[PDB]
């Protein structure tokens, strides 16, 4: 019910400011006050319901071809929204077997890549057993895109051809 | 189901041909005699049925019948409406 | 409405009522048979007839001796063209500034 | 195997489930939650050298990233767009009903959901191990209300992935295992001599084209028979078929589609959709007992046959070619049934045939 | 006769008329019209230039009502996709429709397939068919100076 | 909306379907056709050829060679000639 | 309506229903009207000897 | 309509009559009209007096049409009733 | 990888709807029938048992009585009627062939009176026409034919003999009808029913007299409690707790004389504190 | 070329030379139908050459559906001895085809337009009546329909011959307009 919307503007203030700092997320988190998106009168079942769904939004916003900096604001935001529920059986996020597979090496990248703090926030998540591992995604019954011209075309790339002409 | 059908056609020949047999002459005591006799009476296979539509696709017999009557077994059986397929 | 209904019967029996009668702006069909509004100065010019498509509603009731009648109208049904005077209410310079006149090139 | 999607979001290709289970436990071995301990300044020491460890950089720096990256009532303000709507909806309430008691079927799926999660063992010898598979399936209710067709109601159970089916089929709670039989037109006070489930225990699961048999119970026989019989000859779909033994046959043996219809068929004509909701692994915050496992978790709350000339009790009987029935098929509570037939020494008035109903929006 | 002549005078003149629009003005049927249609070109011993989809754009966008910027991308995308050949073997009245309802989907004036086939003379399921196979490519199909109301990604699903 | 493009009108449909349901009348037997021509000169002293089409429902080139080897034409001024079923 | 009656009567006499838009002659109406305008000969064509002559006159 | 007086029920009549007509106390007449009106009432009874509804599959081995009646001799075909299923070797069915 | 991703694409525009997997959950394709009656079906059948389509109990609507009243309507005036036509086809056909003309006044006397026979019975009033409420009619003809089928022959039989006849009086009940039901009750004692209907002076059916005998019944509701009542209803609520919200309609169904409202009342008042 | 056309279907005609009643072979053939109100003609169908032959009161019978010219004398001489056991003196005069069906496929979509443009005087290619381009050749007078999946059906023959030189003449003037 519009939780989408604020959850994108999260994403994109934070892709804005290109930061991996969680320090910015903190910032962003206090000024535009999710302390309180859960907050308010629910009974049980609404609450739970919509953490579930909230849980889902910021998972499915972290897995490619999602932007290296959006990936990243996702993962601080299921850290930030997992940390802050009401329910007492705190929800857990749902993983997928092939999206681990991938989450994997990127967690490696990001112990590579010297961004501690986002691999420092998902070992934590991974500490506290967030983590629902299911098989397919979510339940069964019954965007910024990633240019494939730059994966193509790189500077690297013409610089190479150039070199080499 | 079949006796429960039979029950109904017997009674209707005989509250039809009462008048007839009043007319003619014959006394209702011939006329339910003709039906006990009828009911007693009632104690290869063929179905004899309405074709609603009977189609041909170069072998594929699509055969839509209507009421009919089957002697499925010695045993009798009725339907109201019938699908049925074959192959030549 | 006061021409009277017609009724034919040769067993089935239809009758034709024309309820209403419709009059659309003055209309010219190009070649390609697009419609599009005459203006009357395009009319001078082009020798076209300026005239106003009529539509008349019609209901068509059936009696087919069976207890059952079956009526269908036949909404807005052409049955012709009728000239338009100039500047009467049915004409396209009705209600137009003068102002709006000289952009049709009109007086 | 592989979860694979079969398409987009109903259904995925058949897999094995306990190389789903193995897959998952080997790239959880030794860096996975597979603990099942609840959680609980010298810790912190610790904590700042194995995150050092894992992430290759120095005490310090653990020890920072930790600091900042520190954890960081009914009333809202300062809106945004979710709470935007949810304050409206909440005032909107508020000039609305002026009793915000919890309605009473939102407590129901509510209770249901939460009855035994976080309840351990009492015992802790037969709690579950790591990696134990739950999957979540959901039976269909069969269709006993005309409300059914339209909507599906369904029942679902936290079956187990060593849960050895014969115990999912042992536990499912329909009420085509009871319904006592025989018909009691002279016999107003008989003793019930057997339920639907003592007597015919025979049942089937179809999955995946082959069919599992309860040949337990030798007073059981081979339901599945009869489909194979017509589906060797005369082929109507279906091509090919398999039968199994159901009773050896454990979970996490099969090899099976998620959000794919699979059948129940239990006494004979009652039949049961055995869709696959989830298959996730154990994870604590739940109950990690065996005994109560199977664990329906979500039941439809069905609506309850009253008797008909008065209001204030079940129906105990069902009375059909009554001679003071208005409707055909009419439900009397044992009071008013005792009082419209058998009077004065439980003998017969006029003519009815009288059969037990059980009532199944009370029961199962 | 009569009518299959009519027909034939509506495509030696560049106007051509779809056999169902010569029945309706005609008791004669379609078919009877297409035979005859057939035996005049055999006696007269002369040929109709084939139909094109832009032959039929003008009365049937003039007729739903449609702007000249509708018509404008209506006919771009029929004449496109033939040329790209999406809707190999249709009839030129199927594709039309397709490109009509296409381009109304995508401008402020929107019509139903029902509406455009009742102008067309096609049902809306031969519009559905069409429409499906030249809605992959659709921006390809569009004019480039085209406003798009509704976004050519967000065009109706079918 | 008026003059909608349409394959085929529907009162021409529905005739056209009445046509193929009723079919084409058949050739029957002489014999057949005789008793039933004369059956109908009983009700009738004169017949027209057109109305009399409808009561034998044969095709009118064999109804009228039946009826040229029995029956004669007799020419009337009033309106016109008609058929005569009488041999004589 | 003369020409619709005329028409309808040939369709329903041969049993079959008749088509209402092919039974209307839109001539009749449109160049009725414009013939009296355009030659100013007052009534009818055919029956031009007892028309009023002179009625419309070019502006 | 000399469709529906060949069953069991049709032959029963028949006999019936037979006996009866052997006995001299009805006219072949009577007879003849009972069995025209038997017809009538079958024909309308048979209609709508029974719902339950049968699908069967056979091979077709002899087909034949002569003046509007259908005679097909399937071989080998199962009738599925609304709950059972019959198997008959080979059945003629009669179709007008 | 992309042309992967493009026929799995393709394959969601060509992807059953859990509709198609009920009752009848091996449904063929040649046909739309399913998998022949099951062994186990028949020995249930047998031995007697209510499936679950053979108890649906679906309320009457109002429309529905007037169409069986038209539909008993039609077929009793068309039972009467069917003797009477063939009685006059017979008398013409009679005459087309008898050739004697004594014979044939005769014969046109009876025509005559069988067309005034025929005329009584068009103009037969409503109330000859309903019946003694125990007449038979062709039900499975009405069920198929008046009613698409919505409703068995003898649901609608058992409908009009017992409730929707109108020899049965639906009017409200007087201060002195339920004097007069109360008082018969007694003195028949509260179990015999149909003499109670017929002793009662009215045409009501047993069923709506012990109604309206219920419906004031003190004796139906125990209203005082007790302390077994008690312990059997904590017992119970332990059984089939879940929580909060007892579901107390299945617990009364394991009670006796009491109902869903005075257990919640109990429950609240003087079993837990509060 | 490369691409031979298979047959599809054979009319052939044979003469009895005798007279025959209808209602007798009606009923006394085991797959006749006759349904004079309809046709008048006796449709009697056989499964081994899968045949259906119309046979006609003045004693002219006609075997369609045969894929082979052999093919087609073999259903017409069985049809004949049918008719001579039902008891007349059938005979078998002047057994002669009258059209040969054939079909083909060259494995690639063609442009219509193209062809209709270039042979206006032989194709007859409206697609809201048939969507498929008519050809008809002139030297061989066989008609040939052409579809947008390169599906060509050559029919009108009286020989085979007719059907292959047809198609080879049909042949490179499809070639030329390969979409
Ligand atoms: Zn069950
Ligand atoms: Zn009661």
């Keep these: 019910p519009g939780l989408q919307t604020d959850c994108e503007a999260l994403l994109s203030r934070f892709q804005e400011t290109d930061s991996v700092r969680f320090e910015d997320f903190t910032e962003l988190w206090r000024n535009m006050k999710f302390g309180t998106i859960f907050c308010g009168r629910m009974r049980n079942l609404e609450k739970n319901m919509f953490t579930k769904e909230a849980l889902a939004l910021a998972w499915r916003y972290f897995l490619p071809p999602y932007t290296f900096q959006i990936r990243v604001g996702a993962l601080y935001l299921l850290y930030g929204l997992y940390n802050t529920q009401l329910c007492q059986p705190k929800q857990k996020i749902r993983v997928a077997l092939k999206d681990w597979d991938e989450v994997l090496k990127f967690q490696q990248d990001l112990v590579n890549a010297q961004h501690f703090d986002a691999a420092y926030i998902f070992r934590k998540l991974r500490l506290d057993r967030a983590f629902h591992f299911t098989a397919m995604p979510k339940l069964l019954s019954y965007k910024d895109p990633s240019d494939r011209v730059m994966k193509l075309i790189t500077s690297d790339v013409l610089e190479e051809m150039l070199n080499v002409h | 189901t079949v006796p429960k059908l039979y029950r109904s056609v017997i009674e209707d020949v005989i509250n039809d041909v009462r008048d007839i047999f009043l007319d003619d002459g014959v006394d209702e005591q011939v006329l339910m005699e003709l039906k006990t006799l009828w009911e007693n009476k009632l104690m290869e296979n063929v179905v004899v049925c309405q074709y609603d539509k009977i189609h041909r696709s170069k072998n594929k017999w699509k055969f839509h019948l209507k009421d009919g009557i089957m002697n499925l077994n010695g045993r009798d059986y009725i339907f109201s409406k019938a699908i049925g397929d074959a192959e030549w | 409405e006061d021409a009277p209904p017609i009724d034919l019967q040769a067993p089935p029996r239809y009758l034709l009522k024309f309820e209403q009668i419709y009059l659309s702006k003055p209309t010219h069909w190009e070649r390609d048979g697009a419609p599009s509004p005459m203006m009357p100065n395009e009319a001078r010019l082009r020798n076209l007839t300026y005239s106003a498509p009529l539509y008349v509603d019609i209901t068509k009731t059936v009696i087919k001796e069976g207890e059952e009648q079956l009526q269908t109208q036949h909404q807005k049904t052409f049955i012709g063209k009728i000239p338009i005077m100039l500047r009467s209410t049915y004409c396209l310079l009705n209600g137009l500034t003068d102002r709006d006149l000289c952009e049709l090139n009109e007086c | 195997n592989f979860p694979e999607y079969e398409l987009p979001e109903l259904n995925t290709r058949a897999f094995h489930v306990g190389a789903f289970g193995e897959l998952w436990r080997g790239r959880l071995r030794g860096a996975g939650d597979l603990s099942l301990r609840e959680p609980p300044a010298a810790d912190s020491d610790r904590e700042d050298a194995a995150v050092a460890r894992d992430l290759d950089c120095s005490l310090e720096a653990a020890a920072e990233l930790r600091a900042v990256c520190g954890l960081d009532v009914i009333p809202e303000n300062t809106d945004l767009v979710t709470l935007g709507v949810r304050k409206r909806f909440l005032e909107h309430r508020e000039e609305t009903i002026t009793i915000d008691r919890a309605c009473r079927q939102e407590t129901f799926v509510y209770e249901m959901e939460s009855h035994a999660i976080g309840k351990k063992p009492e015992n802790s010898a037969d709690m579950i191990e790591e990696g134990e598979l739950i999957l979540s399936v959901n039976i269909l209710y069969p269709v006993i209300f005309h409300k059914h067709k339209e909507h599906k109601p369904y029942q679902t159970m936290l079956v187990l992935g060593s849960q050895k089916l014969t115990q999912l089929r042992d536990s499912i709670r329909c009420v085509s295992d009871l319904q006592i039989g025989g018909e009691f037109s002279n016999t107003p006070d008989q003793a019930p001599e057997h339920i639907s489930k003592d007597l015919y225990?025979?049942?089937?699961?179809?999955?995946?084209?082959?069919?599992?048999?309860?040949?337990?119970?030798?007073?059981?026989?081979?339901?599945?028979?009869?489909?194979?019989?017509?589906?060797?000859?005369?082929?109507?779909?279906?091509?090919?078929?398999?039968?199994?033994?159901?009773?050896?046959?454990?979970?996490?043996?099969?090899?099976?589609?998620?959000?794919?219809?699979?059948?129940?068929?239990?006494?004979?004509?009652?039949?049961?959709?055995?869709?696959?909701?989830?298959?996730?692994?154990?994870?604590?915050?739940?109950?990690?007992?065996?005994?109560?496992?199977?664990?329906?978790?979500?039941?439809?709350?069905?609506?309850?046959?009253?008797?008909?000339?008065?209001?204030?009790?079940?129906?105990?009987?069902?009375?059909?070619?009554?001679?003071?029935?208005?409707?055909?098929?009419?439900?009397?509570?044992?009071?008013?049934?005792?009082?419209?037939?058998?009077?004065?020494?439980?003998?017969?008035?006029?003519?009815?045939?009288?059969?037990?109903?059980?009532?199944?929006?009370?029961?199962? | 006769i009569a009518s299959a002549c009519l027909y034939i005078a509506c495509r030696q003149e560049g106007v051509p008329r779809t056999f169902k629009e010569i029945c309706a003005v005609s008791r004669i049927s379609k078919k009877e019209i297409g035979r005859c249609f057939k035996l005049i070109l055999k006696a007269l011993e002369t040929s109709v230039d084939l139909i094109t989809t832009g032959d039929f754009m003008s009365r049937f966008c003039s007729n739903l009502c449609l702007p000249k910027q509708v018509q404008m991308a209506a006919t771009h995308i029929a004449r496109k996709a033939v040329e790209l050949d999406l809707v190999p073997g249709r009839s030129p009245i199927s594709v039309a429709a397709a490109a009509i309802y296409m381009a109304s989907q995508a401008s402020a004036e929107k019509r139903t397939q029902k509406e455009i086939g009742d102008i067309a003379g096609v049902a809306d399921v031969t519009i559905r068919q069409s429409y499906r196979l030249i809605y992959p490519r659709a921006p390809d199909l569009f004019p480039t100076d085209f406003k798009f109301d509704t976004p050519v990604d967000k065009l109706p699903q079918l | 909306t008026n003059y909608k493009p349409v394959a085929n009108h529907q009162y021409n449909i529905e005739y056209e379907r009445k046509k193929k349901e009723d079919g084409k009348r058949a050739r029957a037997d002489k014999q057949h056709v005789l008793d039933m021509l004369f059956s109908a000169f009983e009700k009738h002293q004169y017949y027209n050829l057109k109305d009399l089409v409808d009561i034998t429902k044969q095709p009118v080139v064999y109804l009228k060679e039946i009826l040229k080897e029995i029956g004669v034409q007799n020419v009337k001024g009033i309106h016109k000639n008609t058929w005569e079923l009488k041999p004589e | 309506l003369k020409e619709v009656r005329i028409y309808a009567q040939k369709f329903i006499d041969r049993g079959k229903d008749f088509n209402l838009e092919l039974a209307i002659k839109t001539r009749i109406i449109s160049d009725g009207l414009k013939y009296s305008l355009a030659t100013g000969n007052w009534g009818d064509q055919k029956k031009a000897h007892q028309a009023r002559a002179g009625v419309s006159q070019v502006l | 309509y000399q469709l529906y007086r060949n069953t069991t029920l049709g032959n029963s009549l028949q006999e019936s009559l037979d006996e009866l007509i052997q006995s001299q106390q009805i006219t072949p007449q009577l007879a003849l009209q009972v069995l025209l009106q038997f017809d009538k009432a079958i024909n309308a009874a048979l209609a709508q007096r029974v719902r339950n509804r049968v699908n069967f599959r056979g091979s077709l081995n002899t087909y034949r049409f002569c003046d509007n009646v259908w005679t097909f001799v399937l071989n080998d075909v199962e009738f599925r009733e609304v709950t059972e299923l019959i198997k008959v070797d080979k059945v003629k069915i009669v179709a007008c | 990888q992309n042309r992967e991703q493009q026929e799995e694409l393709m394959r969601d525009l060509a992807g059953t709807y859990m509709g198609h997997f009920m009752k009848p959950y091996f449904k063929?394709?040649?046909?739309?029938?399913?998998?022949?009656?099951?062994?186990?079906?028949?020995?249930?059948?047998?031995?007697?048992?209510?499936?679950?389509?053979?108890?649906?109990?679906?309320?009457?609507?109002?429309?529905?009585?007037?169409?069986?009243?038209?539909?008993?309507?039609?077929?009793?005036?068309?039972?009467?009627?069917?003797?009477?036509?063939?009685?006059?086809?017979?008398?013409?056909?009679?005459?087309?062939?008898?050739?004697?003309?004594?014979?044939?006044?005769?014969?046109?006397?009876?025509?005559?009176?069988?067309?005034?026979?025929?005329?009584?019975?068009?103009?037969?009033?409503?109330?000859?026409?309903?019946?003694?409420?125990?007449?038979?009619?062709?039900?499975?003809?009405?069920?198929?034919?008046?009613?698409?089928?919505?409703?068995?022959?003898?649901?609608?039989?058992?409908?009009?003999?017992?409730?929707?006849?109108?020899?049965?009086?639906?009017?409200?009940?007087?201060?002195?009808?339920?004097?007069?039901?109360?008082?018969?009750?007694?003195?028949?004692?509260?179990?015999?029913?149909?003499?109670?209907?017929?002793?009662?002076?009215?045409?009501?059916?047993?069923?709506?007299c012990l109604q309206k005998f219920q419906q004031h019944n003190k004796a139906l509701k125990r209203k005082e409690w007790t302390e077994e009542e008690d312990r059997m209803l904590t017992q119970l609520v332990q059984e089939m707790r879940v929580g909060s919200h007892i579901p107390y309609r299945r617990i009364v169904y394991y009670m006796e004389g009491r109902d869903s409202m005075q257990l919640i009342y109990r429950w609240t008042k003087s079993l837990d504190p509060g | 070329s490369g691409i031979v056309p298979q047959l599809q279907n054979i009319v052939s005609t044979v003469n009895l030379g005798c007279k025959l009643d209808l209602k007798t072979i009606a009923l006394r053939a085991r797959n006749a139908e006759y349904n004079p109100k309809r046709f008048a003609a006796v449709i009697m169908r056989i499964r081994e050459p899968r045949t259906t032959a119309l046979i006609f009161s003045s004693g002219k019978m006609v075997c369609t559906g045969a894929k082979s010219e052999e093919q087609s004398r073999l259903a017409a001489r069985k049809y004949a001895r049918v008719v001579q056991k039902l008891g007349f003196p059938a005979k078998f005069l002047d057994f002669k085809i009258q059209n040969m069906v054939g079909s083909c496929d060259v494995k690639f979509p063609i442009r219509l337009e193209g062809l209709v443009l270039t042979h206006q005087q032989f194709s007859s290619y409206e697609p809201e009546l048939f969507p498929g381009l008519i050809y008809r050749m002139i030297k061989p007078r066989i008609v040939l329909l052409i579809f947008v999946s390169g599906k060509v059906v050559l029919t009108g023959a009286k020989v085979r011959a007719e059907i292959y030189e047809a198609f080879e003449n049909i042949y490179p003037i499809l070639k030329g307009f390969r979409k």
């Excluded at chain 9, 014979?103 to 409503?126: H, T, Y």
Aim: negative net charge; glycine residues 4%.
């Design chain 9, 28 to 208: 063929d394709k040649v046909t739309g029938v399913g998998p022949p009656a099951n062994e186990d079906t028949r020995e249930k059948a047998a031995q007697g048992i209510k499936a679950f389509e053979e108890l649906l109990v679906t309320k009457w609507k109002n429309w529905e009585k007037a169409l069986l009243r038209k539909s008993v309507v039609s077929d009793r005036l068309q039972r009467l009627l069917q003797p009477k036509l063939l009685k006059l086809e017979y008398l013409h056909q009679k005459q087309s062939k008898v050739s004697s003309e004594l014979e044939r006044q005769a014969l046109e006397k009876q025509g005559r009176e069988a067309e005034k026979e025929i005329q009584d019975i068009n103009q037969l009033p409503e109330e000859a026409l309903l019946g003694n409420r125990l007449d038979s009619h062709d039900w499975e003809k009405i069920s198929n034919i008046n009613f698409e089928g919505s409703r068995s022959a003898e649901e609608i039989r058992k409908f009009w003999q017992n409730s929707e006849h109108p020899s049965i009086n639906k009017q409200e009940w007087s201060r002195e009808e339920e004097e007069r039901l109360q008082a018969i009750a007694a003195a028949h004692g509260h179990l015999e029913w149909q003499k109670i209907a017929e002793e009662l002076g009215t045409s009501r059916s047993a069923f709506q």
């Design chain 4, 201 to 364: 225990k025979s049942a089937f699961f179809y999955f995946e084209g082959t069919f599992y048999n309860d040949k337990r119970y030798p007073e059981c026989r081979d339901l599945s028979r009869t489909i194979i019989e017509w589906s060797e000859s005369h082929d109507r779909g279906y091509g090919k078929f398999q039968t199994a033994r159901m009773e050896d046959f454990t979970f996490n043996d099969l090899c099976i589609k998620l959000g794919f219809p699979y059948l129940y068929c239990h006494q004979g004509d009652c039949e049961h959709v055995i869709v696959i909701t989830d298959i996730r692994l154990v994870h604590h915050d739940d109950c990690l007992d065996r005994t109560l496992y199977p664990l329906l978790i979500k039941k439809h709350w069905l609506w309850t046959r009253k008797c008909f000339v008065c209001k204030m009790y079940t129906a105990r009987w069902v009375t059909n070619n009554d001679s003071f029935a208005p409707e055909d098929p009419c439900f009397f509570c044992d009071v008013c049934f005792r009082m419209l037939h058998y009077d004065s020494e439980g003998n017969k008035l006029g003519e009815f045939l009288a059969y037990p109903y059980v009532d199944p929006g009370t029961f199962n």
